[PDB]
Amino acid sequence: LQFLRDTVFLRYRTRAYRRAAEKWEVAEAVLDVFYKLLKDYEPQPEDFVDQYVELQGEERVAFKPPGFSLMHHLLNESPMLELCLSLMEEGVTQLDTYAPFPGKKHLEKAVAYCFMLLNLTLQKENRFMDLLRESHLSMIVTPLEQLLQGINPRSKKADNVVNIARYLCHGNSNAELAFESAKILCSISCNSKIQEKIVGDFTQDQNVSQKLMVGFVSCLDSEEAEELLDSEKEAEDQVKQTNIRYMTKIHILNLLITSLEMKAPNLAMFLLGY
Amino acid sequence: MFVARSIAADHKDLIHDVSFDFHGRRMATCSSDQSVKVWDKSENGNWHCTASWKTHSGSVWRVTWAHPEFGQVLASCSFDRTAAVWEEIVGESNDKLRGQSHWVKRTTLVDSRTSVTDVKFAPKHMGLMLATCSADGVVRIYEAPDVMNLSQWSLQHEISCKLSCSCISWNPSSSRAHSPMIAVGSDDSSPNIMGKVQIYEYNENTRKYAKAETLMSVSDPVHDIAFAPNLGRSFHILAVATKDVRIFTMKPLRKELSSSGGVTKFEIHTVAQFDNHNSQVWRVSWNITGTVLASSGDDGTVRLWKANYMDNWKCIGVLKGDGNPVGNSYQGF
Amino acid sequence: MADKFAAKFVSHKISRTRWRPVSASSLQQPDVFATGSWDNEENKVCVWATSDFGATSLDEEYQGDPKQLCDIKHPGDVMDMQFLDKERIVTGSSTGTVTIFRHHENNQTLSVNQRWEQAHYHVGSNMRAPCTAIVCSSPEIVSVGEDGRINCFRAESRDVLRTIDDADSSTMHGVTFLRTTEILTVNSVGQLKLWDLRKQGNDPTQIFSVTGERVPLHCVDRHPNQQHVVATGGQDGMLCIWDVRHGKMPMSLLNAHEAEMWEVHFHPSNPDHLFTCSEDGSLWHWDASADSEKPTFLLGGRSTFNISRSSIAPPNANQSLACAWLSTDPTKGQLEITNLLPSSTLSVNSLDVLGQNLVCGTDAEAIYVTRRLFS
Amino acid sequence: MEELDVDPAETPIPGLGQQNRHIGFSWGPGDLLLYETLYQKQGNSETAARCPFMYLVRSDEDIYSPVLRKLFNESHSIFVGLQKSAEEASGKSRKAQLVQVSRNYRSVLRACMEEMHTLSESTRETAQKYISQISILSAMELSWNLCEILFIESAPAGPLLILLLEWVRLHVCEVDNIVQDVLRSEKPTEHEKFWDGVTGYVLQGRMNEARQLLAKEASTSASARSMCRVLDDLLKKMPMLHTGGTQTLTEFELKWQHWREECERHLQNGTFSSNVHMEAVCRVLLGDEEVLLEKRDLMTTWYHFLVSRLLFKHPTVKPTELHFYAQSSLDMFLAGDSCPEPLDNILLAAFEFDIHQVIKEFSIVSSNWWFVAHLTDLLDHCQLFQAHNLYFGANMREFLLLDYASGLFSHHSLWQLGVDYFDYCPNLGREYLKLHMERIPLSTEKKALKALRICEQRQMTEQVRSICKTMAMQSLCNRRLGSALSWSIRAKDAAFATLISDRFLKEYCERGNFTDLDLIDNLGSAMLLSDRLTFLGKYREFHRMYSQEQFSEAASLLLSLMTARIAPCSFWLTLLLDALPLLEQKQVIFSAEQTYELMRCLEDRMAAKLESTSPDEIQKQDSSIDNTKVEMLRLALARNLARAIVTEGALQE
């Protein structure tokens, strides 16, 4: 564990590459592994019970579940957070490079593992905190929305959500990527006290909001209109992506209803143009 | 604040001098016990009898150490008509190993047939010589040519200094435009004789010492003689020890233009004269910076004299070995 | 510009570089130097030679070269390796073994003299541990480790002369002389600890932590302008400077960064310039003051994005200027660290500065050197 | 010190007061090395008991107190900041930074004070010397405030009164103690120190809370309520800059006199004729000196006496009359009970400006030239001053600099600041540095080397080379020829370099081989100094041109080297012994005539060798073998040269 995380997951970025494509597939080879770890590890209440065990009255160290540990590390500041961030910025960057590259493919795969891994992180952190609350063991965890507004220490600004949104513009043929971005957005939105920060993020700049509206127009102008969904020449791909952005707007509207369930501000007036 | 004992080292006889390292931590006692005892101030400071070996015959009056660039070498004088020379050589290569040490007589200057009244090495700037004086009125001046060639000693020069030699003194010199000089205080008794202290210079074109001066004034057997350390000091001062205390300032007023040497024009003032010891004053000891002088006499007291911003001189310490001195003191006008 | 570097692609990883000593005091670069492996081919100690100084050396690649001489292989990484005297070598093993050679420069070999096979270790698991810091003032030897023991030895012994154990010990980061027989460390708690070589006991001899964002301090060293004032670096990014021989107090809390100071080391020819190396992914030269108005060693290097060499001087007639040192209230600003990346570099694990000369070996599989640190 | 000749400051020896003996001496570095010696003995009889005690008389006993290190080091820090600033700044800015550094130094001494406490309440035996040092350092704080305020800003009246009242409130701590006691015991008006605190408030000019207690008094007594109201009006009208800084002093003096006259009016009305405390307050408010001299006992502070005089009567001040007021206040205070005191006269001489005699008073009271040194630096920065300056009759700066550095040398690391302060008296400082350096034990690469650095940036190579050769030869004294070597390369000494080169060559005589060859091979053009090492390295060169059989350039180098005509003959033996097979090989560059000055010099050298010594002093079966081998060698030389001539001629065809 320490081997792979330190020797590789800390060091993979530190490598020299004659061809850039190598970084993509290396990162995928590491991300997928962490995903199986998360996916497999299912917590239990007894995960919190004891570290020294009396082997014949001898309290011996018996290290916690690797799951337990990997969560709690993620649950507090982890370099995993930072490298996830990185992944996101280079994803945005390569997408801004609309000239095709050998490795963009590995990029969407890698960032996809990012989305879905973090999704499971969310679906399990709830129960983890839940078990923690009764526990007499002193563990520290920070809820992740706080991370989402944390000051990114390369830009010195909380553009986590902005980086999330940057992929909506890029999803001109990436209904998946738009989908995972938005579903994570609403999964976060499941709680309160963020519309203020969201409004500030929107209100940085006119040109920021202009590229934003370009992206939202890209997301919305095809909710059944791609000129290929009825074509059997392209076949299953078009109808499948129609399904995809169908669920996207599903959860878009779920999020909007939740936002209006709270008082002003509510970002739907914004998004409608108000 | 160290209280005084009368308890002394295991020397069954009078202890003559103690000499300290010109680089620190090391000391040695010379006595009439004939055994030279090298003590070493430990890191805790505890100095123990680290060495003790015989060196001479008769009362070994004086041990003089030399800077390790001289080698870790020493001179010693005693009632043997001669002067002994010991360097401590050790075995092996000192990296993290310390082998066995051993005392080495590099030489012993027979000094004709005359008792070595004083003896000490030569200053840095003039090459590496050494001077011996005897009650013969004759001063022998010996030489070692090369760095590994220590044991050999040739009388490079001799200066005949009229009355029997007692106490000698090297002039500090560090300028090529400056010259080496020697002052000689005589312990012969003649009220008739003025200038009982004689002063010689090296006139370089003559390649030789001439008589620079005498103290036509002195008819008292000189106990000891002591130049003040003067190398940035643009003139010189002399401390002279007998029943009283003589302090003289010697300023180059005329340095000649075509007749330098033989004698050069100096103003000499008796810038101080004191009987405050109220007894015969044996030795005066300078601070190495040449700013402080200690003085002792038969009463076992030491008086401590300095110069002010008029350069005049006051006793700033009075230390009793027959009693218990008083505390602090300060004053202005 | 600042005297560009000679880079020799050594095809080797570097962990520890330490000058071959001749003790006493002299200015030259020790042409001879012993090297502890990060992973060269194995973990080993090699002997290497450097054509000292731009004088009589501008050749053998471009601006000199270090050359392999011999080597002998070593269990446990060489995290630290210091020299007792001219040719007696003491290194720590990751196997928790204290290893002492006598080098043979003429035979080009290393002699396996003395081994304390026993060192710092974990309790409740019965597992061995490497040593955190070795202390060599000939011939007294001190060892300190993760578990917190104290290992006091006279030179030349294969059995422990003493190991001070405590009812209170911790993880230790960096050590420095305060005096000849006084010692300080910075710890992983934000802890400044003191001891005297002669007097010790149970639980740390002296313990300190105060307001000012105590963070795990990783590196400590005694200033190239004075020893009893020392500097420490830790997690928060702020450098903490202190004056001691029995009591601590801050010269400065310089807001010199925002993140961990892994290792800091001191400029000889400039008792007031610094260097920092960090496996956060960067390596900075630290300079007095700030601003680009003085030659910028804040953004200097990085191949591109280069900036330095700006100057202006008041004649002191009707002109006034003030700077940060003239303020004694704590929490000062940044003080000019520049990260440098030639075309690409990996974890630099050993570096040395002598005068304005610098050597450094790395995980970038090469060596980087400069004759001059400025221009 | 500054005055460098004083009454002998004798150092007590409690020994030899009952058990005397004659004394012997040697000088310590900053201490004094006394022992017993046997000549002109004070005592009686011999003694031989192996006595290992020492006599270390210390004028540097200060080094053994724990706080002085912090004292002087942080003084050092602020000080060096001061000087490194002194080349910059101007006028108004300069004044501002002066005041700044003043406050900084006072705060530092304050910090010393609180930590000094922390020591004292812990200690039960050493607390008394802590008391002594706290007393002196408090004296320096108070005096330092007085001097700065009196001089630095050189401000006019008004702000002067403000700052002096701030001074007094800083240096007087009783009033808050009475505050705490009054709040501690019962109600403030029921407190026995009620009116005591009220008097303190009147003294401190804090009429707001003074009226707060006046309210308690008026509530308590229904007869003094109007009395308190009148006094409250007085406290409302009293001077807090009656007119602003853009006004004229005429208007402020008008308001002052209006307040004054109404206070006398109310007094003579008999309005305050039933409350002793408040009517005494009325005399105080009118500045009536009888009450002041009565309260002298509760005062204990005749400077407070004078400041009360000035405020209650002299809202405007004149420097010349300040001395007059001081005289009057001093006489009135001594009238209660005259007793000897330095500090009063010291601060007098402060008000009559004579900084130098003030310093003299300090120097007779104490022995710490430190505080005066900082006084001096301030006066240096003050851009000209004269109170009978003793810098035009003495040199206070370098005096205290050298005293200070001399104290610094006392510790094996604490001398370093002495270096930093010879950084400002070097015409004797650097030389005294080398002086003390050679005299003190030393090993340390880095501190020594840094002293070197310091030197060369000042371009002072002479002592440099002296020390380098000295410590190199100590290196070889430890049998370390390598450090000797590199360090001679540091000193640039062809003499010793050739010497140890010849030691190398004797090692080659011993072993026949090279070691650490490249360590010299890399030395490049620097080789030109040591000719013996130059020859040895060129022998290496020819040796390996042999080992890879580099005939042409090998022979050319050998020719050049021998034309250079360097090294002893016994080795040119082996030289041409190795030159043999080249001479054998068919080569046209062979210049037989040059080979023959080689051989004729060989004849010359073998003749000289025979004259100087016998080739073989050992009689053995192999000595004649070696000899006849030598003759055979030269015979081989002749025959091979003959063959080479044959080949050359056959090729000249």
Residue numbers in the entry:
A (entry chain S): 733 to 1006
B (entry chain C): 1 to 333
C (entry chain B): 1 to 375
D (entry chain A): 1 to 653
Question: Which text from the study accompanies this structure?
Answer:
The nuclear pore complex (NPC), one of the largest protein complexes in eukaryotes, serves as a physical gate to regulate nucleocytoplasmic transport. Three scaffold rings, including an inner ring (IR), a cytoplasmic ring (CR) and a nuclear ring (NR), anchored onto the nuclear envelope (NE), provide bases for other functional parts, such as the cytoplasmic filament, nuclear basket, and permeability barrier. In both CR and NR, named the outer rings, the backbones in each subunit are formed by one or two Y-shaped complexes, also known as the Nup84 complex in fungi or the Nup107-160 complex in vertebrates. Here, we determined the 8 Å resolution cryo-electron microscopic (cryo-EM) structure of the outer rings containing nuclear ring (NR) and cytoplasmic ring (CR) from the Xenopus laevis NPC, with local resolutions reaching 4.9 Å.
For NR, the final average resolutions were 8.1 Å for the NR subunit region, 7.8 Å for the NR core region and 8.6 Å for the NR Nup133 region, where the highest local resolution reached was 4.9 Å for the most rigid part of the NR subunit. In our model of NR, a total of 15664 residues were built in each subunit, so we extended the number of residues by approximately 82.6% compared with the NR of the 2015-model (8,578 residues) and by approximately 41.6% compared with the NR of the 2016-model (11,064 residues). However, in this study, according to the high-resolution and isotropic cryo-EM map of the X. laevis NR, we found only one copy of the ELYS density situated on the convex side of the inner Nup160 in each NR asymmetric unit. The AlphaFold2 predicted model of the ELYS NTD is fitted well into our cryo-EM map of NR. It is obvious that ELYS has extensive and tight interactions in both the β-propeller domain and α-solenoid domain with the inner Nup160 (β-propeller domain and α7-α34), suggesting that during the ELYS-mediated NPC assembly process, Nup160 could be easily recruited by ELYS. The 9th to 12th α-helices (S555-G675) of ELYS come close to the 8th α-helix (D557-N578) of the inner Nup133 in the adjacent NR subunit, stabilizing the head-to-tail connection of the NR subunits. Therefore, it can be concluded that the question mark-shaped density represents Nup205 not Nup188 in the NR subunit of X. laevis NPCs. In the MID, the tower helix of Nup205 (α55-α57, E1195-T1293), together with the finger helix of Nup107 (α34, Q770-F814) in the adjacent NR subunit, is inserted into the grooves formed by Nup85 (α23-α25, D493-E549) and Nup160 (α40, G1255-S1282). In the CTD, the 63rd and 64th α-helices and 75th to 84th α-helices of Nup205 form tight contacts with the 1st to 4th α-helices and 7th and 8th α-helices of inner Nup107 in the adjacent NR subunit, respectively. These results suggest that Nup205 plays an important role in stabilizing the head-to-tail connection of asymmetric units of the NR.
